[PDB]
Amino acid sequence: ARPDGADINSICQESGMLAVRENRYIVLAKDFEKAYKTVIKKDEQEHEF
Amino acid sequence: KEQNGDVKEAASILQELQVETYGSMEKKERVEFILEQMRLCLAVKDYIRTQIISKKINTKFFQEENTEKLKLKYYNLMIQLDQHEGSYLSICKHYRAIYDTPCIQAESEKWQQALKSVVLYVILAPFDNEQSDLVHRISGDKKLEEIPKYKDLLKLFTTMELMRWSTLVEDYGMELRKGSLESPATDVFGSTEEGEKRWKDLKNRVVEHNIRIMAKYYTRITMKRMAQLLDLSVDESEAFLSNLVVNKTIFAKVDRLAGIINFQRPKDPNNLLNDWSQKLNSLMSLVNKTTHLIAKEEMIHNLQ
Amino acid sequence: DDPIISTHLAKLYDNLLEQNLIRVIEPFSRVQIEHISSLIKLSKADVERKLSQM
d(CA C30, CA C28): 6
Contact yes or no for C32 and B242 at CB 8 A: no
Query: Distances from the Cα of B4 to the Cαs of B8, B39, B218, B262, in angstroms?
Result: 11, 11, 62, 59
d(CA B111, CA B8): 38
**Side-chain-side CA neighbours of residue C49 (13 Å):** 2
Nearest residue to B38 via CA among B61, B10, B59: B10
For residue B222, which phi and psi values (nearest 5 degrees)? Answer: -100, 150
Contact yes or no for B21 and A22 at CB 8 A: no
Q: What is the largest CA-CA distance in chain B?
A: 102
Element (H, E) at B300: helix B273-300
d(CA B232, CA B240): 10
Within 10 Å of residue B176's Cβ, how many Cβ atoms? 14
Q: What was the resolution (in A) of this experimentally determined structure?
A: 5.7
For residue B193, which phi and psi values (nearest 5 degrees)? Answer: -75, -15
Which residue in the set C23, C26, C30 is minimally distant from B257, CB to CB?
Answer: C30
* Nearest-neighbour CA in chain B from C48: distance (Å): 17
Contact yes or no for C31 and B255 at CB 8 A: yes
Q: DSSP letter string over A1-49?
A: -----HHHHHHHHHHHHHHTTTT-SPPPSHHHHHTSSSSS-SS-S----
User: CA angle at residue B26 from B42 to B33, to 5 degrees?
Assistant: 15
Within 10 Å of residue B262's Cβ, how many Cβ atoms? 20
d(CA B28, CA B33): 8
Task: Number of B to C CB contacts under 8 A, please give it.
Answer: 26
| Mutation target among B211, B246, B247, B260 for the C interface, most CBs of C within 10 A | B246
Element (H, E) at B202: helix B195-213
Q: Say if residues B110 and B80 touch (Cβ distance below 8 Å).
A: no
d(CA B106, CA B140): 17
Q: What is the largest CA-CA distance in chain A?
A: 44
Helices and strands in chain C, H and E counts: 3, 0
List of long-range contacts for B264-268, beta carbons under 8 Å, 24+ apart? B264/B218, B264/B219, B265/B215, B265/B218, B267/B219, B268/B219
